[PDB]
Amino acid sequence: GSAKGNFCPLCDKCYDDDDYESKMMQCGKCDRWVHSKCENLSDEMYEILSNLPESVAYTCVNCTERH
């Protein structure tokens, strides 16, 4: 077991005791988990990455810079 989960760099709720159901995004640069909903990630757009063969990479706000 990894015993990890990371937390959204914006707010990530607080501690996140329900990260299992906590729609978080796994970054491709630092592998950091960003809030799917809080990061303003649309479900459809979020679905497109999840439907892809992993060719893409989800980059978090810090990695994506410009903020």
Ligand SMILES: [Zn+2]
């Ligand atoms: Zn958040």
Ligand SMILES: [Zn+2]
């Ligand atoms: Zn990142």
